[PDB]
Amino acid sequence: MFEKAVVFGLYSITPVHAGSGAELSVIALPIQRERHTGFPVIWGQSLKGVLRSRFRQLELDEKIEVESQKWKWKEKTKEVLKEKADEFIKKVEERKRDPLLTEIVFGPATDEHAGAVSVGDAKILLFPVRSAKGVFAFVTSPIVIQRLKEDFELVSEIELKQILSRFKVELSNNETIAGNALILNGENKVILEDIVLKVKSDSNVIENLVEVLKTLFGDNFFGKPIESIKERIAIVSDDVFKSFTRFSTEIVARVRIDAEKGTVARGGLWYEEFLPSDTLMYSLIAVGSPKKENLPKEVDNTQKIVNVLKVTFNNAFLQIGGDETVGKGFVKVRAGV
Amino acid sequence: MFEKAVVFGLYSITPVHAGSGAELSVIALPIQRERHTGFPVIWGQSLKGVLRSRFRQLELDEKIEVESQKWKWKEKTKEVLKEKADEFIKKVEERKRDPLLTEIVFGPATDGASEHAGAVSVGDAKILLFPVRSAKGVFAFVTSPIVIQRLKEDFELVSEIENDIELKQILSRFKVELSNNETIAGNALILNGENKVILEDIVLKVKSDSNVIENLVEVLKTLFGDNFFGKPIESIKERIAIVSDDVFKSFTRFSTEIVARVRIDAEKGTVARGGLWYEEFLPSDTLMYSLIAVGSPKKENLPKEVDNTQKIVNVLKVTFNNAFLQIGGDETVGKGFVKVRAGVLT
Amino acid sequence: MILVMKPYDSLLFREPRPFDVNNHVARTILPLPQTLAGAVRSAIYVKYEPEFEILGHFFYRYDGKFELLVESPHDVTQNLGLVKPHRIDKLGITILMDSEGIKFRPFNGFLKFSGLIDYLQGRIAEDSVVERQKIFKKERRVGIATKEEHFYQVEMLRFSDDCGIAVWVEDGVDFDDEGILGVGGERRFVKFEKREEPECITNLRSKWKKIRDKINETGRLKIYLATPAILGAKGYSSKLDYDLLGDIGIERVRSVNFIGGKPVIFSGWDFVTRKPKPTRYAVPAGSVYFVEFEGEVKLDMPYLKLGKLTKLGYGLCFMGVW
Amino acid sequence: MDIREIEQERASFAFKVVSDIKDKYSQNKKVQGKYSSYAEKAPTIILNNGLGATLAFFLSKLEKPIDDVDYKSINPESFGNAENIAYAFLYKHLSTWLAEGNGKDSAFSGLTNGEDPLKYIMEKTAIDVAISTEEALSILNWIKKFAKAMLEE
Amino acid sequence: DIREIEQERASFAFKVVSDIKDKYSQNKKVQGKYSSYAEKAPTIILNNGLGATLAFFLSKLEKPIDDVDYKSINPESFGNAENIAYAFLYKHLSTWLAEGNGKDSAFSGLTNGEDPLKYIMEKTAIDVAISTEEALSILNWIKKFAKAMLEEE
């Protein structure tokens, strides 16, 4: 199964609060965090639930143009199913089912077969921390590069394969490797939100990381110049990076006000935690050949079923988490071409 | 899922104190800031809370004009609900449920949470122009390429939502870089015979380029018209300064107002023991812009005048353009008032 | 040929309790050999009781050196002390002895193949054991998804960044080396890889003669269950059939002593008939059988397959001395 | 070198200095109350005017000529009035925290690298002064908490 | 890198106060008179304006107006201690308002081309108000440093 795979990228335009956690240490609703590492994460189960719904609503509006040809789902099901396809049309319009093409891609609805694709967990790749010079910095960890090193080998692999093995850096708890826009002038040191870091001299690690990003997310970087990003990577130690993700996220106090008195209601006060904006996530999308059920001629093999997913989702803007109405969740996606 | 996006300019006429109770600091009561940058910010939950409260009040008082016609929520409830409408209005009369248009736009009350959601998604108010004192002139409106890049990235969101093309072409020519010891400011601040401007306590050499401020000025005219919140925009173009990202960060962190409030014992006539606390306020004449994304109304059985998002948009634009709100709470001491001017892009 | 299977994300292996709409909480169990056997069957089918035999599966950790981790034996106390059954002719009963008290708690964890080459002799070092937390953790995802009640809790296997699952396959039956396949319950996948047989196996394979002759001369043999086995003849029973040891050449058995945990209850889905497979009970992995054999063992390999479904990976047993 | 270790160092240092002041000046509550009020007032002065301005303002309340700006040479016990003693102690604590942290053995050894913070403000860039301002605000917050906890007025 | 004007203010004030302390360490009267004049100067500037204060400094110096170039004043060439203090104060104020803390410094000086007295003579009131703010700020810094490190009377 899952003959090939494609790489997705995410970039929080607005702070994201997706899911919760079984820890519940201080904040009432923390964000989904990995167990062994403690990094913030977007589970593939919840990430699929917004990927599929966005794909579904496109079918009702017929904007899934395949091979530069618009898709018309009403006739396609009749063309490939017939007989009860008219009843299939009624069931889909009854909200008891889902459009045909999506169920080949994202699996059947609650009411057979399986989806041709699998949605992996969205592992963090860049985290924003307030700095002294270079107002905010994109911080990573050496093992985060290691995680990206193995996963990226599934799609790209050959020049990037050779440079992928070059990602091997050991960092102490205070040294760092940072871009020019973050290093304090004269005093070769970097300050990242109350923590003083010493810059370690290097000329490959930061360049290599931004090299694979361009080759996997295009020359443009989510609406910003790529060169303006290369000066703001600050690779820190694992303990420093782990500590940042636990404490540098936005904890937002919230309360409900009753108009009868104008004050707050008793017990209606809690704190919720949000992933910061400008957080470059990435999730591996595994795609396989769909189950043969008289599918249309455009979705036979895996290479055709991945192009539709990549094209329809590149430069998209979907909402994750449970705070859509208050402007939380919008993320720009860049599929890896 | 969102068809139309309407921007929301905010101009503070009084100091604004958006309280941030999730701060482990006893020095003062800080205003919430973007943690990863330090810029002042107003969360959508706070912004939507004052929008919904104001909108509900207007519907209750029957002041909203829909399609250039008055709106009667009581009459519309019978047209929408028919049966059990009298039972429903009892909940609103008991302050247990919100009127129809409020529930359609922002969402239902807490009791009817699972019934449906709202039609609008109130974004986050981010900084666009910061007022700092200057040696020449009363003060200056300050921004930075990071804020400009953020504003340009915001139009991409609107352009993609509405499938527009000219929206991303508005700032496609904006390529402004600034050294730490450089700035681009109008002629109302430049010191005579020096090409220097002194913002707060920083001397900045003035760069020689006028296109950056000119194209920036007309961008606000696209979103806010010629009337810049009660004054001509050309009258304030001369006092707009572009500073580097780091220099702007220093202004945002430290130039915000800090006020030492106190309480006094009535009997003794002096300050009561332990009754002394200080607060932080956003300075007046601070320009912030939000971004409201509105989709089709989820709740069905709705009147034709609020059929689509375009119908919903005209309700928000009419009822909120050139209107004064109270964001954050220090109302009893006259803090938080802000002028609001909406408007769709080209 | 080993089959390294590094999980990209966490993995969940479905316990027999149903989970569709009512039992929303879905726990996880250790990967049964049938699941990995089916995954390998899918892999070989894509590349080109199955016709090929899978010896078994073990955990592994790759931190500079690549080592395979075997489930912690039930013969090891929590204080890293072996337990030996000695019989009391005065009372006519046999008890398990740890030389530090009649009561003990088995040590949960793992045991590297270096441990195996030393544990079979009758001693265990300190570095030969690894705790459970160093390999995987029980990460429980919550609130995944008229859907007010669909929120369901799921517990997965959060492997450490340097730890994965390795599947042992007999020499030959070559197929695709690098790729990705789906394993588990809720749709997940691993980045598997084909690697030459590790030097640990040949270390234990070469030193098989020494332990074999020690067992032969001492008249005592211990059998360690690397993977669970279904040892029943008609039904499913934990009692070791004496004929089963007759294959290796045991002329007679004097006494058999076995210590193991609760049995593992499992089934499967018969894709041919679209119906669930018959439920089976298997002796849990890590149990050890202490026997007093008469005769000699002529097995050329340090392992043998016991019970049914041995091709999947069940019944991987090691001959050791006590 | 995480955030929590820095907070640990701040708490330990603030408790140490506040306990030292409480023990040494236990009898006279006037100096204790003056120190507590001056601590609770200090960070806001830094925010409104700046670290250099408030450092100079502290140095101007010593009622005795100073040969050269230096926190080590100070001796608050010499002065008579409680006001000058409190100002001297607060300035000494602030400068020693900003110049040495909680000692060279601790994880945080200060920012100015042994220099007088007034001199550091004098000849360093604005970014370093801002960082020292944040550090001073944090340590003053901790000092205020501990002083309110223990010192009596 | 950028440098805040407050840093230049502090550096200039410390430089001038340390210079007068080191040069006239034996002269207690000079130090006391200079401290008193520095503490009394801002009030005079507020009451009568910056130009009146600058001219009144020269009135005690006995030097005539319209030949006022601060570079051409030897402040040590006056016998009286009061004259010495007034010359030092006038030279420091004029140097700050004409050159700041140097050309290379962040503050290059407001007038930058001639003596500030002439600047007040033949320039508009907005510029003299800016100069008055600058003079008040530098006078505050100098007064702080003098009250701290210079012997009073």
From TrEMBL, chain A:
Bilayer-crossing regions: none
Boundaries of every CRISPR type III-associated protein domain copy: 12-332
Protein's UniProt keywords contain Membrane: no
Residues forming coiled coils: none
Keywords: Antiviral defense
Record has Cytoplasm as a keyword: no
Cross-referenced InterPro entries: CRISPR-assoc_RAMP_Cmr4 (IPR013410), RAMP_III_fam (IPR005537)
GO biological process: defense response to virus
Signal peptide location: none
Classification via Pfam families: RAMPs (PF03787)
Listed NCBIfam families: cas_RAMP_Cmr4 (TIGR02580)
Name of the protein described by the UniProt record: CRISPR type III-associated protein domain-containing protein
UniProtKB/TrEMBL annotation, chain C:
Pfam families: Cas_Cmr3
InterPro entries named among the record's database cross-references: CRISPR-assoc_protein_Cmr3, CRISPR-Cmr3_IIIB
Signal peptide: none
Protein name: Type III-B CRISPR module-associated protein Cmr3
